[PDB]
Write a protein that binds this DNA or RNA. Sequence first.
RNA 1: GUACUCUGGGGAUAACAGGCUGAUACCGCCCAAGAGUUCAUAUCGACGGCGGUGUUUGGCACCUCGAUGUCGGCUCAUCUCAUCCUGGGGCUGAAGCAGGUCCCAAGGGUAUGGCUGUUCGCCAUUUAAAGAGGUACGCGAGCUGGGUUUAGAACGUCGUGAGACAGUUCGGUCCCUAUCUACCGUGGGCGCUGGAAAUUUGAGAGGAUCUGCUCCUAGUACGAGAGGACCAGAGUGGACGAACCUCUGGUGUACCGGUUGUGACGCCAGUCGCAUCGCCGGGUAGCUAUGUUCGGAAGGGAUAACCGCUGAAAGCAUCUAAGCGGGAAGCCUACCUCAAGAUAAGAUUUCCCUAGGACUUUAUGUCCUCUAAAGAGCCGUUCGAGACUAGGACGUUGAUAGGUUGGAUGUGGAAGCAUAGUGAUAUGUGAAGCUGACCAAUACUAAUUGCUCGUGAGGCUUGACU
RNA 2: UAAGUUCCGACCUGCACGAAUGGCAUAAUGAUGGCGGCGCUGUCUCCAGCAGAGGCUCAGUGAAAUCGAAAUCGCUGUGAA
RNA 3: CAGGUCGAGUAGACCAAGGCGCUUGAGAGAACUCUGCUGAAGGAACUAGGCAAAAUGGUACCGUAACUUCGGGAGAAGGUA
RNA 4: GAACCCACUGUCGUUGAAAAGCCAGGGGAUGACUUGUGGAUAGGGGUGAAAGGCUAAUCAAGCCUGGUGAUAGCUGGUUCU
RNA 5: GUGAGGGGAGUGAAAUAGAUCCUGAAACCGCAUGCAUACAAGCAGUGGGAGCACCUUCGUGGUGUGACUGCGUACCUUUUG
Lengths: 54, 122, 117, 211, 119
Amino acid sequence: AVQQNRKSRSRRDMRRSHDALTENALTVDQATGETHRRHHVTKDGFYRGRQLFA
Amino acid sequence: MIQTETMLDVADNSGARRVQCIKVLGGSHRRYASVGDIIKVTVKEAIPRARVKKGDVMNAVVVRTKFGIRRPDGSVIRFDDNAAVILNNNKAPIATRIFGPVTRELRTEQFMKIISLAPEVL
Amino acid sequence: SGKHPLVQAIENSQLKTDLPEFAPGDTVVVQVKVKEGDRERLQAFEGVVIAKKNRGLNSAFTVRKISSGVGVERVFQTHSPVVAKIEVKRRGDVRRAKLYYLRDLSGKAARIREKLP
Amino acid sequence: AIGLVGRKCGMTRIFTDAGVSVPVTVIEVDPNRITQIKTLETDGYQAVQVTTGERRESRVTNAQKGHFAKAGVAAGRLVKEFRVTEAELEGREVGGTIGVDLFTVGQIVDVTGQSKGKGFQGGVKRWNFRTQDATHGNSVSHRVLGSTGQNQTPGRVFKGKKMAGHLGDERVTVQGLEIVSVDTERSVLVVKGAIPGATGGDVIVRPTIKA
Amino acid sequence: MRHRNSGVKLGRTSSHRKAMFENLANSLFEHELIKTTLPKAKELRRVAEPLITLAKNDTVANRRLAFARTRNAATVGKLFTVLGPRYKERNGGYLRVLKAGFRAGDAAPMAYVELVDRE
RNA sequence: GUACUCUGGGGAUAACAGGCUGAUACCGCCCAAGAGUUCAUAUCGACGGCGGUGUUUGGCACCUCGAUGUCGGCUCAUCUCAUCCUGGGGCUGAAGCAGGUCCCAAGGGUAUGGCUGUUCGCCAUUUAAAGAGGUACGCGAGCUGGGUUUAGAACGUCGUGAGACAGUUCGGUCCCUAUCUACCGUGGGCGCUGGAAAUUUGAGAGGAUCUGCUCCUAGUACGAGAGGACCAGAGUGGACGAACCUCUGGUGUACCGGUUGUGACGCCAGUCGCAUCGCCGGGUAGCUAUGUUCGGAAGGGAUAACCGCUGAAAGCAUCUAAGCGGGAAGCCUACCUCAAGAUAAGAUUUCCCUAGGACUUUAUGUCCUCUAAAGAGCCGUUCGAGACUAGGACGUUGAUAGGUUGGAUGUGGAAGCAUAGUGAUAUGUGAAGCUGACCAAUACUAAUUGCUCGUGAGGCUUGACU
RNA sequence: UAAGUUCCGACCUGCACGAAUGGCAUAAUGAUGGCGGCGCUGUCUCCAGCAGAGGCUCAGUGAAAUCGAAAUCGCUGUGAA
RNA sequence: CAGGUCGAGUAGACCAAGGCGCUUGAGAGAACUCUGCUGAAGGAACUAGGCAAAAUGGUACCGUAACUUCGGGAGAAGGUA
RNA sequence: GAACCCACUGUCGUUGAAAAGCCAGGGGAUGACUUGUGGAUAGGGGUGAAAGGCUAAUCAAGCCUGGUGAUAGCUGGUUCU
RNA sequence: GUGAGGGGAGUGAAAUAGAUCCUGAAACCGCAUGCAUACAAGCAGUGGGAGCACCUUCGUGGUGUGACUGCGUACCUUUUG
């Protein structure tokens, strides 16, 4: 099964009208004060005022 | 739970030894027969010189099944074989002895004789 | 006690309080209440306990016996009022909970050794 | 009619004196509280609105808080309406309660619930379609639909054709059940038979309409 | 449907799954802090915590059960000499699972598994 | 001669399906010799005549030969009525039970096997009944491939032969990941006269609609007897459908045990890996039928054929022309589910927002500063909810998930150590040990500090009260 | 066989058998053609549960045949029908 | 060329010496498709046709019909430990 | 009955892992057996335990280059006002 | 990233002549501005026609858009069509 007519650019863009991306949830940490992904350990090993690597 | 092509033992001395069910009576597209239901059977093995012969088409009533019967209190009773008793054209019992135990589902005006001649009713 | 507290409370009100202790492999006599018309009588069922389920009010046990050449098994609901009396006659000695292997043995092979105190 | 909102607690059995075993379902009832009464003059029909259960303040919104505070009853976990008549409306006021004593043993009722969800299901389970042969050369078509239409006439599929799709999770009413026990101390209804839904679901009990 | 069912699959056979979780538990007991994927980390609790619970009573039968489950003598010795007395007074919750972003190779979500009183 | 075949062309021209036609076919009507003890018309009806339908056999050659690719079976259907069953009637050569014929009626229902590739047919045994047709002689981008119709081989027959068939027999490759329309499910956007959380009315749509047997009336009415009811009640079944898991069972590769081979853990003991979960016996939750429960009950309204009341035209008669009735499983309601995108966008309860400047395009006008409410969402712990979504519960003012403690259940007599035995093994400690998904408690672990969206009283005209 | 257009035995008005294009038989042999039994079974009544691989979601790479152009609904009729 | 434990064996299960984990992964655990395991009662009713599945299966001993070209048929069939 | 040589049935695969395969079963397996190296037979010819089979994925007359721009009462196409 | 690629500085008449570097068309693919578009059925145009935005010689002007409305089944070939 294949198309009988080539699809127009208009209909192609209409189909793609649902492809937009979305933003993550970011938050400024307390103890250190940089941005991190919410509910995740910061890239330097801190989470809720505890250190993972001394 | 007896259906077409099921083989059954014969629980009386009418002469037949093994019968095969060929029809479940009593409704369109009816699937199964349980204790107390009428079936059509063909005779597959019989005692020599009997009143019944091989190749006869007859009526029968189911007396024991392996699938079992339910009771009002939630219990179930199961037997080791499937057995039947032969009837005439008027659907009355036509035997002079019964072999093995029987149930209460035959407490019906149609079926006093089997109970009366049976040794044990459990 | 795998159910909700309300269900347990409603079930506990109907329990029997006089059942004997028995295990698979014993031989028992059960008195069954039979109501023919309004004649009341008791019918005796004697056999070997081959399976037992302990589930509170939903407890059950299966009894197998040979009657005039045909084997027959009945599953009794323990707490039903139709079960009038249970008597243990002889305590068996087995190695497992369910004795379904007895269905394929007859007579000489189906004997159970007696447990000796 | 006027009924009750309860919760399904589970299935069990009741033994009678003769020895008969009756399968039953247990319905836990927290006494319903009347929040609003609707009339012909204001709304154009007659109904009683009730609430039951509990809900925490952080989860009750301000609008619902005011709505409950006007009636003078605590916030519940759900709100429901019962269509009534003038005769049934006698003796009912905002702030009163309805209990299990509304029913009697031996009464015939209808029970409404939300059936279990089976998800995406095919023809065999959804519509009792028959499978094709497992052998004798069949290639890859055992549980498939089969044919779905005729031909150039009409050259389409009719509306309402039975196909695969979502099954379950629907409102279902079971009619003609019988009340077996009305336990007032425990606030429990015990009714014969099975009712829709899973344990913990919300169910509605009303007097039977097949009167 | 999978109503009320427990357990994971993770695209492995049952023996492979069981062996992999035994390996993870051994590594966790050795190093006290490991990094893995989030589903593996969340399932690792149901396997590792009962071992610590069992190691609270030092008996020959308990040691043999621990060996039957771990197949590692050093792990058994550590469990019955260090970790058990450490958690004698703690009612569960010996592990800690923390989300740690995603992995470069396949964008898989990751997590850290750490013992509660590591240092 | 070519079925071992090949190239150029044709729907200028055949086989399939469509189309036109209706001789043929099927169905209906008109006349009525006669048959029916008399009596054409209860039921048949010669000789002749007039139509309808578009099922059969055909006629034509308009479409397709730069391809519309199948005789039956399977699966899934939808419509007609010229009705097979069930429902309502008129007449009868209708005593009753039954039957014959015609009228109304399309709501539901409407066999399993033996033989053959069969459609069909014959046969066996059922049923209330096993209807007649249309849909590309419905359905092969949904399945098959037994028949026919390629290439091999043989028989009968024909031909000198290559070969052939009002014939027979054995064997013989069935491709396609679905763009559009349609259909089954499930979301995103915007709209609905400021915004928000809930509860709702019902224009309308869909589902369902079947029926046997026994008892009672009553061995009564009827009948010479043999037989044997209408109307009106009760009970219990078949098939179909839905929900559910208390009971009976199945499954239950994260639960318990027995056992074979081999390898390892230093060795004994004790265990683990591999052999289809190695094999074997059980089995908790969940799912499930063969298990359990429930449904098609009753009642209103208008009618079909048919039966009337009163009544003239037509001094009588007459259901009709004025007027007034009864009447069916059929129509509208009634029962269940969905339903305001019903753009006509409906209703009710409650909640939120009332600050200052400048400018011209004097307008629900545009730019500053100040304000972010009721709520919604992102995120997290998750679910008897689920493809992704959506929906439900909870986020420290906490039992949402895991763990821990207790219980329950299943399997069944752990390890170690003692006794008795030469030993295999048996007994005691002890119904012990171990026990996924279940019930109940319990902050030990994880649901952090947060962020985004949503605003600042909601134009005009007319009317009624204020 | 309850029921047999196939099978087996016989009958012989052989449409149109017949003796080295061999006739009638024949023990053994055949992934050879037809018919009937025992055992066995999910072939079936009528399907249910479970395990692995896909399907589905996310990150990376990235085809195909086809295609005059498309703002590409139903019905009844019409019309190269 | 080719070892060990069983074994008639270079068959087979698990191992030695020696080689490897096969150049996309991570989740989820719907319909439907492929490959497997189990299954109540019935047991070919399926179908062109028992197609496919299920079933039998070792060693030693006992016992074994018609028919026959006297070799066979024959591991006939069946039974025991 | 393994190796080895074949190719009877079924599922899958059919824009395949593969321009003829995989998996589960199947046949022969001291012989008219299987196989390596090197040779012989050349197109109206060869070879064939015979199917019009094979003769480099091509066979009722191989492939390549020439005659050659073969012929086509046939189909298509044929460009500004 | 001591990469690729770019931004400045500099050379040159010219670097949008910067190395696959003269000119740089079309298919095809982006970003920005103006207007229209989420109650309405089809070869997508054509004859009317309100409103809006910018320009303006201030119009009976120009440029862009086209709510609503009458009519309207592509092109070629071959054909009785």
